[PDB]
Structure formats: structure tokens, C-alpha cells
Design an enzyme around this catalytic site. Structure first.
Site, PDB file in Angstrom:
ATOM      1  N   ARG A  24      -2.351  10.750  58.618  1.00 48.02           N
ATOM      2  CA  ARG A  24      -3.257  11.841  57.717  1.00 48.02           C
ATOM      3  C   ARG A  24      -4.440  12.393  58.629  1.00 48.02           C
ATOM      4  O   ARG A  24      -4.532  12.353  60.009  1.00 48.02           O
ATOM      5  CB  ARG A  24      -3.957  10.923  56.506  1.00 48.02           C
ATOM      6  CG  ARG A  24      -4.690   9.902  56.973  1.00 48.02           C
ATOM      7  CD  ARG A  24      -5.689   9.535  56.072  1.00 48.02           C
ATOM      8  NE  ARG A  24      -6.297   8.373  56.431  1.00 48.02           N
ATOM      9  CZ  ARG A  24      -7.559   8.037  55.912  1.00 48.02           C
ATOM     10  NH1 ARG A  24      -8.408   9.230  55.326  1.00 48.02           N
ATOM     11  NH2 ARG A  24      -8.216   7.204  56.134  1.00 48.02           N
ATOM     12  N   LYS A 160     -18.891  11.081  77.548  1.00 43.64           N
ATOM     13  CA  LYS A 160     -17.934  10.273  77.530  1.00 43.64           C
ATOM     14  C   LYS A 160     -16.575  11.196  76.916  1.00 43.64           C
ATOM     15  O   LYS A 160     -16.883  12.182  76.326  1.00 43.64           O
ATOM     16  CB  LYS A 160     -17.889   9.131  76.526  1.00 43.64           C
ATOM     17  CG  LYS A 160     -16.585   8.128  76.540  1.00 43.64           C
ATOM     18  CD  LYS A 160     -16.905   7.133  75.727  1.00 43.64           C
ATOM     19  CE  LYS A 160     -16.598   7.294  74.070  1.00 43.64           C
ATOM     20  NZ  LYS A 160     -16.732   6.072  73.221  1.00 43.64           N
ATOM     21  N   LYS A 162     -12.517  11.245  76.323  1.00 35.84           N
ATOM     22  CA  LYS A 162     -11.163  10.401  76.068  1.00 35.84           C
ATOM     23  C   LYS A 162     -10.040  11.245  77.000  1.00 35.84           C
ATOM     24  O   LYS A 162      -9.759  12.504  76.981  1.00 35.84           O
ATOM     25  CB  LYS A 162     -10.906  10.607  74.764  1.00 35.84           C
ATOM     26  CG  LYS A 162     -11.730   9.847  73.819  1.00 35.84           C
ATOM     27  CD  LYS A 162     -12.049  10.168  72.390  1.00 35.84           C
ATOM     28  CE  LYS A 162     -10.567  10.195  71.772  1.00 35.84           C
ATOM     29  NZ  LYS A 162     -10.418  10.815  70.243  1.00 35.84           N
ATOM     30  N   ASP A 191     -12.333   7.317  78.920  1.00 33.91           N
ATOM     31  CA  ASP A 191     -11.726   6.043  78.434  1.00 33.91           C
ATOM     32  C   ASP A 191     -10.378   6.531  78.209  1.00 33.91           C
ATOM     33  O   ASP A 191     -10.151   7.596  77.104  1.00 33.91           O
ATOM     34  CB  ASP A 191     -12.404   5.785  77.058  1.00 33.91           C
ATOM     35  CG  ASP A 191     -11.793   4.843  76.237  1.00 33.91           C
ATOM     36  OD1 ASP A 191     -10.843   4.155  76.512  1.00 33.91           O
ATOM     37  OD2 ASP A 191     -12.661   4.138  75.387  1.00 33.91           O
ATOM     38  N   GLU A 219     -12.261   3.475  81.253  1.00 33.07           N
ATOM     39  CA  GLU A 219     -11.920   2.292  80.457  1.00 33.07           C
ATOM     40  C   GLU A 219     -10.525   2.102  80.243  1.00 33.07           C
ATOM     41  O   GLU A 219      -9.845   3.028  80.117  1.00 33.07           O
ATOM     42  CB  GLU A 219     -12.634   2.574  79.267  1.00 33.07           C
ATOM     43  CG  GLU A 219     -14.074   2.815  78.957  1.00 33.07           C
ATOM     44  CD  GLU A 219     -14.710   2.624  77.511  1.00 33.07           C
ATOM     45  OE1 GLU A 219     -15.593   3.303  77.313  1.00 33.07           O
ATOM     46  OE2 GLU A 219     -14.088   1.781  76.726  1.00 33.07           O
ATOM     47  N   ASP A 244     -11.559  -2.886  77.919  1.00 29.15           N
ATOM     48  CA  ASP A 244     -12.136  -2.849  76.580  1.00 29.15           C
ATOM     49  C   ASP A 244     -11.256  -3.548  75.823  1.00 29.15           C
ATOM     50  O   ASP A 244     -11.341  -4.683  75.467  1.00 29.15           O
ATOM     51  CB  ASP A 244     -12.230  -1.207  76.314  1.00 29.15           C
ATOM     52  CG  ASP A 244     -12.616  -1.188  74.769  1.00 29.15           C
ATOM     53  OD1 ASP A 244     -12.985  -2.158  74.164  1.00 29.15           O
ATOM     54  OD2 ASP A 244     -12.761  -0.124  74.186  1.00 29.15           O
ATOM     55  N   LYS A 268     -17.730  -5.055  72.108  1.00 30.29           N
ATOM     56  CA  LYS A 268     -17.973  -4.568  70.715  1.00 30.29           C
ATOM     57  C   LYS A 268     -17.840  -5.584  69.629  1.00 30.29           C
ATOM     58  O   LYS A 268     -17.246  -6.655  70.054  1.00 30.29           O
ATOM     59  CB  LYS A 268     -16.908  -3.563  70.557  1.00 30.29           C
ATOM     60  CG  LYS A 268     -16.837  -2.458  71.307  1.00 30.29           C
ATOM     61  CD  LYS A 268     -15.706  -1.267  70.799  1.00 30.29           C
ATOM     62  CE  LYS A 268     -15.552  -0.058  71.899  1.00 30.29           C
ATOM     63  NZ  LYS A 268     -14.616   0.685  71.460  1.00 30.29           N
ATOM     64  N   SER A 296     -18.878   0.708  70.250  1.00 28.30           N
ATOM     65  CA  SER A 296     -18.573   0.198  68.731  1.00 28.30           C
ATOM     66  C   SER A 296     -17.492   0.989  68.232  1.00 28.30           C
ATOM     67  O   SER A 296     -16.585   1.779  69.116  1.00 28.30           O
ATOM     68  CB  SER A 296     -19.967   0.607  67.930  1.00 28.30           C
ATOM     69  OG  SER A 296     -19.779   2.018  67.786  1.00 28.30           O
ATOM     70  N   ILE A 298     -16.040   3.359  64.844  1.00 32.21           N
ATOM     71  CA  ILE A 298     -16.835   4.383  64.056  1.00 32.21           C
ATOM     72  C   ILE A 298     -17.656   3.673  63.028  1.00 32.21           C
ATOM     73  O   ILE A 298     -17.330   3.249  61.902  1.00 32.21           O
ATOM     74  CB  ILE A 298     -15.785   5.391  63.350  1.00 32.21           C
ATOM     75  CG1 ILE A 298     -14.811   5.886  64.483  1.00 32.21           C
ATOM     76  CG2 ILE A 298     -16.504   6.530  62.680  1.00 32.21           C
ATOM     77  CD1 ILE A 298     -13.571   6.621  63.742  1.00 32.21           C
ATOM     78  N   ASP A 323     -23.019   6.636  69.978  1.00 32.44           N
ATOM     79  CA  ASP A 323     -23.005   8.058  69.526  1.00 32.44           C
ATOM     80  C   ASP A 323     -22.230   8.177  68.127  1.00 32.44           C
ATOM     81  O   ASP A 323     -22.483   9.323  67.681  1.00 32.44           O
ATOM     82  CB  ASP A 323     -22.369   9.143  70.105  1.00 32.44           C
ATOM     83  CG  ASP A 323     -21.131   8.990  70.392  1.00 32.44           C
ATOM     84  OD1 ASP A 323     -20.453   9.902  71.318  1.00 32.44           O
ATOM     85  OD2 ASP A 323     -20.266   7.901  70.290  1.00 32.44           O
TER      86      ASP A 323
HETATM   87 MG   LIG Z   1     -12.849   1.963  75.100  1.00 31.44          MG
END
Ligand SMILES: [Mg+2]
Ligand SMILES: [Mg+2]
Ligand SMILES: [Mg+2]
Ligand SMILES: [Mg+2]
Lengths: 359, 359, 358, 358
Positions: A24, A160, A162, A191, A219, A244, A268, A296, A298, A323
Site C-alpha cells: 500500500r 543521508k 538511501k 544507507d 550503512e 545497522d 536504535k 530511529s 519513523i 530527522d
Molecule cells: Mg540504516
């Protein structure tokens, strides 16, 4: 200081930028909020969002775990016997790290409040301000470079990105376009989210080096369970490699450190099941000369405040990735940390500094 | 709470049983006492005896280190910034672990007082009473069997026996005689103090179990830097092997755990340079399923009180070797832990519980 | 020295012999225990029991007052300026004297610890030991006399008897049976707990006089607000009259003393909102040549220890009513004062001398 | 903390401006200095000047009282038993308030040193600085006016003026001239020193109001034994009336407060026999909503330091009259309080804070 009540509620905060999953499109950030009321009248706060792909925890599993396992075990207990409370939280059930973390947040909040200190000072008080990076949403290299320069102007020196989803060529073109608008004025953190195979990771990271992109770190380039592969990337490149998903617990940290499979570790609370675990991981890493970063999932400012108090307290935690709250259209919590550009400031009140639901 | 004054003094408590060193005969237990005064009126206490053979620290090296390095760096510092303080104590100079330990004791003393809790509760508060073992002094097997009987009659069901000095035949005969008196009514812990070679230790330990001596554990059978040798003994006997002198710091703990060279680890504040390092060792050990014991050097109730607070707070610490104070003619301190037979009880006031000199 | 934490806990200690109120039957003695911890390493203790009929304070009101009013006004403060702290505690809210008293107890405890002296010495240290009376439970005159003699053998030369509930004749019968049984030397203290009207009290007190019962004193014979009536009883009998409920604060003490409505004054920390007020009441009385007694509400050894430290420190305090802890099936506190028959001894450690839970 | 030695010595500090008495011309401020040595090595200081007209105490009566009565009673006593010591000082002999005051100063000095705190903090620590008024000598209206303007430029916004000696018209002419120079830039405290009859005082004070002189307060307008008269003046004027010579002891404070004979009370250590009594007077007054002021007799910085420590410690003490030391040509003491214009600051060392001779 005795626990007399434990309650959970759900929240759904609209996202400034919705994203799609395999099933979704997500428009809101959901999370379970935990309130632990102590006999002193004090209230400890905790937060736990679902991460079906990372932890496997969902809103339902998190709430059930808290109501059926943790709650009945914590009621009546006193923070004077913390070692035993933490052990029970971590061992009454396997997995459910998110549920455990949400409870630990509220407990450490209560613990700090009991001692009359901001949580970060109770844990070591190394720093009272810290710089968070900011994520540049994936897009056409030209659009990303535009956002990047504007984030640079807003005070963000660390960005950062992705990678590991599209072609290696696509990733590289994006980063190049980004540097074209910001040069070295900003540091670049990547990452890969376990998107590459070992040899494929070495190739892509070397290519970026040959292209002089100056990547700060990458990462989890490979699959979380592929330690030997993670180590191959670490030993074959000059760019630091950060573990990670390969590290949730201190035992997993010990394995990664022992085999020297990574240069850095990303911590985290959701993964470690709270602060106790997070502390052990960092202390372990520190003794091996490995610095850590705290990120962290979301989360609203609540979860990020707990994360930030832990991060701010340790000398060995030198990078921050907080962030998430800036990606919400609204801030539903009163108190906690405050943002000024990329600078996060710790509050001065005892505990987390979370007053309650904003208005 | 800020540190405003740091003082040191020396004490000499006559031993109930003088012993001989390679250069002289020792009649008193010497120690450097540290007192840190905070702007709140609180006073923190610490102790450090010399251990020329174990750590290399002497009364003069200890005192000089505190006045010329640790003191000038600590005066004016706030405990709300503990991390920075701990880092300075451990890194402003190399070695000098005993001096670092003494200052850490008084520092944690104040930290607990600042948060208003007994130190052991501040560190986890797992238990408030613990059982200490008692040392059966080396002599003819006959006299040792007698003492063992008296100690047992006094409530001590766990006795510690120093071996590895004389020939194996002599150790076994001593241990045999003791068993012939108290039978399986007591647990026996041995400390070979690096007196055996690996192959020799294996032979000695196997001969003991073949004689049904039922040894609980053997502490440091081989030389401290012979990890491979320690491991050999560990994998060749059914008796648990405990590392002592092979592990001073958390980094050395990591190496021992990483190589699985020992079944247990004996932690001592003087070796770890205090409580922060001791916590790290225990935490790594726990992550590896390795339980720890906490012992000490020849110290008064102050030093032992500090070690007991650390030991009592952790779940992974399951054995205790705190008979040192029981070896002194007079108790020069007021407060701290209390003894009832073999049972040590933790004081309840904030900090270490030491009130000052005996009244 | 700064206050870093203020906490409260509820306790319920089973009584040796329960009693009935207007709504229920009390089987345990409840109290709010207060602990104030300072960054100097000191820990102050205080106790506040509920007294819905006397003060109006309940477990809930007491706890709420400390949590929402006293606590936020004290956390972060230092004891450099005691005058200001005590003033603020007494004026932050009206009434709630029990809440204020438990906090004052813990504050004085901490203050004496900082000075390195037992609280009683910091306040004057007039005496190291003191004689407490013992209460003879209300029963048949035959049974009360039996208990009385029994307490006499145990070392109690002063006994307290509650009167003013039943018939005057019943009180007299019970007291006369006791006086004749224990002898005239023993001292018998009566507490009418506001049960008589002024004329009714003068009659009763005079009847015991005619019976030569040798009553040491009569506590609060009339309604606490009836000062004119209290004064009438004082001026009509030969027995000394002691004000209790008529005097909570120093202002009220001033009123009773200026009008000469009573011969003595019974001081209680719960009523005065702590030690500062109690100390002012006694000073006032002394200046007027009026001696005082210190009592308490149904409290454990903690509350009694604070009361005893205050009581032991002043020369003008010559009577003590501290048997409450002896009415509990168990002692839940470690340290504090010690009992040896009717003799109460002050501890030697700084502050109250309370170590913690038993 | 035990008393092991008590010594006395006489000092004579020349006055910046000598004054005449009914028998001679006074050029020096004399007082007996008491030094109490404790076993810890600490030394407690006390001072007492003679006041033949106010208290009746003389240099000889004071020294003799200390040596023959107080000294033999305090030697060997521990400060842990302060109450008993204070009771002995105040009751071993009647009157001799100045001698009692001197010894109490040296005792509170040691008591505070024992606790390791500045005396003012040990007594409540309400404030650490305070404003003292300054005396405008009696002379021609024009000279007084010149002095008033002068003292004002030096920071003294509150001036004290002695009246009631001369004709009422003269006092007013003096005050009027002073108001003409400085206007409302200063507050004016008057001390009538019992110089008027009740009716005459009422008249004199109303005339001052009519003249818009804006008098802050009038001390002891009538004879010290005339309480009824003092009260008449209090109730007939809008100007606050302060009792001084009418109140020496806590019992007299009680009488003045009980009858509402004065609006304020002036406390002096020499009158109260020390700090214990002063503390009782103030506590008594505060309970009645009556604020106090603390002044002194002709004393050096030592006596004033003790009085200032007491004054600074209490919330209810809102006015200060400590200009005595400023009237000496020399300051023979090292330590104690320090002046900066009209601002007096409390020292930071334990006890009184005086080291010794300058
Ligand atoms: Mg990561
Ligand atoms: Mg060993
Ligand atoms: Mg009563
Ligand atoms: Mg006057």
C-alpha cells in the site's frame, strides 16, 4: 517510586511525504504511545511504531505484548530494583523488541525523574546539543541536488541518502548531481538497507571512491545475517562500513566487533529493545574503539527525545540521525528536545522533558 | 553537585596474620584513603592499597597520581557530566589502576548521594545481601582441616584455598584433610595464582576430581598472559576455570570471552581502575553467558563496601570474595556493609554508606 | 545542600486493639510517610496520619497537598534560608497542617544531619530521656483497674484515661476503681476530648475532687471553639485544665494564654504544621509561666520520634504522651527513640536517628 | 563543644562626637568584651556597654556578674545542652541584662561555629544584606538640614531623629527644615524617648501630620511604664508607634502585644539579655502581625555584628538601626559585618565572623 498504572493509546500523524510499500501507500505515521504512572504521580512516556519489515512488530503485537506480558509483570514493582525489572522486560518474551523499548523509555523517564535529572545527564551527560543529519528523498538527480542545496542553506551539514534499490549507476548519478550543488560543505551518509550482495557492494563503493564522491559512510550494504559478507565490504573498501540491521542486541554487537565485520555500529532503541541494551552495545563498541551512531524508526518527537537523551549522554556516540519528527506535518507532543536548524537541544527538566499531548 | 576538594591520607591496620614478601615481613595492611568533598556538603570515600606484584601500584605512586593528575582535572567538575569525568580518570594517564579505582569509589559515592540512593541500588540493586567465602590459611593439612571446621561453625559454607605454591601432592593432601573434616558440607574455591603450567594444571585439576574432592572452581591456574594456556586448562577439565589476573580491563575481558579461554571472570576494582570498567566487564561477560565473581586486594571495609555495592547490583555477578576486612585486628571505618557470619548486608543510606572513621 | 527528591508512601500497621468510628471499624493505623533526600547524602523522614475528626486531613488530602503544592515549591531549594522555606510551607496553602508537619519533620531531620547533631540537641537538648504515660483502654471499672495495675508493674507511673463519652457516673466509677487500686501517688491524666459542656465539666471534675481521686489534669473538657467555656472550667476547679484541640497554632496559643483560659497546653506536630510552630507555642507559654505537654495522633515510632526530639529539647515541656507506637502489633521503623518501660531514650545519631524500614 | 575558658576585657573607643550626661562629658564608647574559649580551639565573642539610664548596668556590674555568676556556671558545659545553659544565664540572677547579652553573643558565636555556619543562617538566614538608618544629630534646624542632605548623598535614605526633649514647635521646625532640603527623598524615623505625656504626644504627632512631614514612625512617645498611655497614642494617630523601652523581655512583649499598645517593637540585645529573648519577642510579634526593628546601644562593630546577624535572620524583622559603629573614630575589630553606604552585608565565615582586634 512504584509503578501503579500502565496505559497504551494509538496515534496516527500525517506524513509530509507519503510513501508506498509492497502492499500500500502510507500517509500517516502510526505508533503506540505508552504512559506509565508512578505512585509519586509522575508519568513516564514511551513510544513504539510498527516496523513489519525491520523488527516484525505491528501495532497489534506491540500493544498485546504490553498488555498481556510486560504490564502485569511491572505493576507494583519499584525502580529501586531496576536490574530485575530490565531483565524481566527483556526475558519474559522473545523478540517484540519494539514493545520492550516503548516500556523502557517510560521506565528510564521515570528513573531520571526520580533522581531529579534530565535523562541524558543521568546517563552520562556528555553533550547537551547535537547535530542531526537530514534525509534527501530519492528522486531525479537534479531534484535531489536542489533539495540538498536548500537543506544546506537551512543549516544541515550532513545529509543521508538511501541507496541499493535502483541500479548502481542511478545511485551514483544522484550523488554526483548532489555534490554539484553543495561540494564538500555537507557530509554524505548512505544507507543501502541490505540492498547489495557483497561483491556488488565492494564494486559500487569503489566506483564512488574513483568518482571522488567522498562518502562519509555506508550503512548495512549487505543482508543482515551475512556477517562474513559485511566483513568483506569492510575489508575491501576505504569507506567506513556501518552495521545497522546486523546489530539489534549486545550479543550481536559482540559478534560483529569480535569478527571486525564493521567499522561502525548504528544503534536504535526499537532494535535494542530500549536503552539498557543500547547502553551495552555502545560500551562494548567503545572498548573496541568502534564509534556508534543513534538513529530511529519513523517516530514522533517522543521516541526521538528518548533516543536523543541516550545519544547525548555518551562520548562514544558521535553521529546522530533524528530527522523523523521533521517529516511529520504536526508535532503532537509538548516538551522534549527542541530543533533549531540541524541543532538539537536537550531539555533541562528531569526525565525526558515530555510534558504531555500538545495543544 | 560539584567537586570542590580532594584529600588523601594513609592508614595502617595491623593484620591478624602477618605474611612474608620476597623482601620483608608484612604486619599491617597499608592503604591510601581518598576523600572528595562536594559543594553540597557530601563527602565521597575511596580506598587503594599497594599491590607491587599484582598492579605495580605503590602508596607513593598512588598518592602522586591522585595529587598531580586526577585532582587538578577533577576540581570544579560537575557530576551532571559523569561521562567526561570517567574518561579523564581512565585516560589522563596509563596504568595506575589503583589510584583510578580509589578516585572512582569516592566519585560513585558522590554520584549516588547526588541521586539520593544506596550505590548498589543506583547501579541496579539486584540483591541486598550476599554470601562471602572465607580464606583457609595455608599450613599443614591438619591445621587447615581444623580452621575449615571452625569457619564452617561460624557460618562460612564456602572456603577459598590458595594452591599452586607447593607440589601438587601437597595441595591435594591439604584439600583431602579438609574434606575429611567437613565433608560435602562446604564448597571449595581454589586460586592457583598462576602457579601452574597448562599441562601441569590439567593434571593437577584432574587428579583432584578423580579423588572426588569436588572443587567448585579454580582461579587463574596459569600465567596471566598465557591465554592459550588458560584456554587449554578450561577445555580439558570439567571444573570451572576462572580468570583473574588475565583480566584487568574490559578489553582484556573481551579477548578472554572472544576466545572462550575461561568459564568465569573474577572482577576487582583495583584491576579495573574502578567501577565503570568493572561494569563493562560484567556486561560483556553477561552477553556471553559468563558469570562473574567480585573479589578484592587486602583492603578495609571501605574498599570492600565499594566492591560489594557493585557486586550486589548485578544479576550476572553470583559469587563474592569479601573476607579481607575480617583479616584486620580493628575496623577503622564507621558505616558501610555489615557482616553476620558469612552474610554481608548492604547499608541503606545514599552512596557507599561509609560515615567516616570509627567513633 | 539541595532537596533533590520528595517522596511519600502509605503504610497500614495492624493495631493491637481496634476501635470503631461513626462509619467503620478501624483494624489498622494508616499513615503517609515522607522522605526528603538531599544531595549532601542526608535523608529526612516525616510522618502524617489522617485525622478526619480532629484536623480534617485524610490520606488523600495529605498526599495530594505534598505532591501538588509542597513538593513543587521545595524541589531544587537549599536549606541556606530556613526562615523562608518554613514560611512558604505554612503559607502556600491553608489548613492541611498534617501535610505541612510531615514535611517539616523531614526538613528538620535533614537540617540536624547537616549540623551533625541529634535533632533534640540542635533544638536545645534539655534532656536525654523522658517519661511517657500509657493509656488505659475504656472498659468495665473492674477491667480498667486490672490493666492499670498491670501497667504500673511494668514501670508506668502515669496513666491516661479517656472520659466524656459515657455517663459522668460511669467515668467516676471507672476512675475511682483505678485510683483506689493503684494508689494516690500514681498520676492519672484525663482527656475529655471535647465531650462536656462547661457546667457539666465543672460538675464532673468537682465530683472527682470530692471523691479524692487526685486527677493530675483534665485535657480539653469542652468544645475546641468554646474558649469562654474552657476558661470557666479552668477558673472553677482545682484540677489543672489542659488545652488541646483549642490550640493548634501559635496565634491560638496566644489567644488562650492572653485570656488565661487554660492551665496547660498540649502540643502536637500535626496540629502545629510541624516543629517551627510547636516551638513558638512552647516559647509563648513559657514566657507566660505555662508548661506544655507534647502528644501525637495515632502514629508509628517515626512520628513519635520527631515529637520526642522536639519534646526532649525544651525545658518548659514537662509532660509526654507517646504511647501510640506501643499500640501497634509491630514496629516498622529501624532506629529512632527506644523504649524501656515508660522511659523513652533519645538516640545518638544526627537528625531523628531513623535508619529506615524494619 | 565545651566551654573551657571565659575572659573579659575593657575597651574605650573615642566618639567622633562626644555628648554630655547629667553628670559629665562622655568622649569614649566603653564596653566589656567577652571571649569564650572552647575545647575545639574556637573563640566566641560578646560585647556589652554600660547604660546606666536605660538598663542600669555599669562596667563594674557587668564584669562582676560575668565573673561571679555566669562564668562559674558555664565552665565545663557543652553546647549540645544549649537550653539549660540559656536558662542558667537568664535565671541565675535577676536583671543584669547587658551581662547576659554579652555572654549569649559569645555563646551563639560558638554554637554557630560548631554547626559550621554564619550565625544569621543558623538563626534563619532570611536576608544577607540590610539597610541601616543613620542618626542626624540634634542642632539648629539649618545644621540638621545640612547633615540630612549630606548623609543622603552618602546613600542613607533613612534618617533617625531624636525629639521630645525640646518644645514641640522646635522639633517640627527641625524636621521641616530637613524636609525642605531633601523632600521625600528620605524616610524619617523619630524617637521621642518617653519625652511626652500621652495627650501631649497625640497632639505633637497630629501636628506633624498636618504639616505633611511624612513621619515613618515614632518610637516610645510616652513613659516606658505607661502602657495605657502608649496605647492611647497608638489609637489616636495614623502614624505607626513603636515600643522601645516599654519592651525589654518576651513577657513585656506579650503584654504590649496582648493589649495592642503599639504598632511595632524595637528589639535590642542588651535589653533582652541576648539573642534567645530577642528571638522570642520577634516570634511573638510575628504571630500578632507586628513587625520588629533591631537597634542597639553605643557599641562597636562586635555588638552590632551580633545584632545584625539576628536581624538579618528573621523575616518579621524589617527595619534596622545600626549606625553606632559609624560614630566611632576607630574600628577596633577585624571581621564581622561590613558597610557600603547604608548597606550592611553579612560575612560568610562561621559564627559572628570576627577574627579579633584590628
Ligand atoms: Mg540504516
Ligand atoms: Mg585470584
Ligand atoms: Mg487530647
Ligand atoms: Mg529608641
Amino acid at each position: 517510586m512504584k509503578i501503579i498504572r500502565i496505559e497504551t493509546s494509538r496515534i496516527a500523524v500525517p506524513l509530509t511525504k507519503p510513501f508506498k510499500t509492497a502492499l500500500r501507500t502510507v500517509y500517516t505515521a502510526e505508533s503506540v504511545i505508552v504512559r506509565i504512572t508512578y505512585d509519586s504521580g509522575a508519568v513516564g512516556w514511551g513510544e513504539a511504531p510498527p516496523t513489519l519489515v525491520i523488527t516484525g512488530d505491528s501495532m497489534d503485537s506491540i500493544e498485546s505484548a504490553i498488555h498481556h506480558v510486560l504490564k502485569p509483570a511491572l505493576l507494583g514493582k519499584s525502580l529501586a530494583g531496576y536490574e530485575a525489572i530490565l531483565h524481566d522486560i527483556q526475558h519474559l518474551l522473545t523478540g517484540n523488541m519494539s514493545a520492550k523499548a516503548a516500556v523502557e523509555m517510560a521506565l528510564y523517564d521515570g528513573w531520571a525523574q526520580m533522581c531529579g535529572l534530565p535523562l541524558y545527564q543521568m546517563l552520562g551527560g556528555y553533550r547537551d546539543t547535537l547535530e542531526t543529519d537530514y534525509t534527501v528523498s530519492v528522486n531525479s538527480p537534479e531534484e535531489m541536488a536542489a533539495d540538498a542545496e536548500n537543506y544546506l542553506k537551512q543549516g544541515f551539514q550532513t545529509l543521508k541518502i538511501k541507496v541499493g534499490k535502483d541500479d548502481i549507476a542511478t545511485d551514483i548519478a544522484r550523488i554526483q548531481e548532489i555534490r554539484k550543488r553543495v561540494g564538500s560543505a555537507v557530509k554524505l551518509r548512505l544507507d543501502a538497507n541490505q540492498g547489495w550482495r557483497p561483491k556488488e557492494a565492494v564494486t559500487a563503493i569503489r566506483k564512488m571512491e574513483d568518482a571522488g564522491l567522498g562518502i562519509e559512510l555506508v550503512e548495512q550494504p549487505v543482508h543482515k545475517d551475512d556477517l562474513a559478507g559485511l566483513k568483506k565490504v569492510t575489508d575491501a573498501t576505504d569507506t567506513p562500513i556501518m552495521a545497522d540491521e546486523s546489530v539489534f542486541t549486545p550479543r550481536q554487537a559482540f559478534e560483529v566487533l569480535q569478527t571486525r565485520s564493521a567499522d561502525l555500529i548504528n544503534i536504535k532503541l526499537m532494535k535494542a529493545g530500549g536503552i539498557s541494551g543500547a547502553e551495552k552495545i555502545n560500551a562494548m563498541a567503545e572498548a573496541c574503539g568502534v564509534e556508534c551512531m543513534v538513529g530511529s524508526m519513523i517516530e514522533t518527537k517522543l521516541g526521538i527525545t528518548a533516543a536523543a537523551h541516550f545519544a547525548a549522554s555518551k562520548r562514544n556516540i558521535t553521529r546522530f540521525d533524528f530527522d523523523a519528527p521533521l517529516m511529520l506535518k504536526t508535532d503532537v507532543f509538548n516538551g522534549g528536545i527542541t530543533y533549531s536548524g540541524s541543532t538539537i537541544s536537550m531539555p533541562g527538566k528531569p526525565g525526558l522533558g515530555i510534558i504531555g499531548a500538545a495543544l
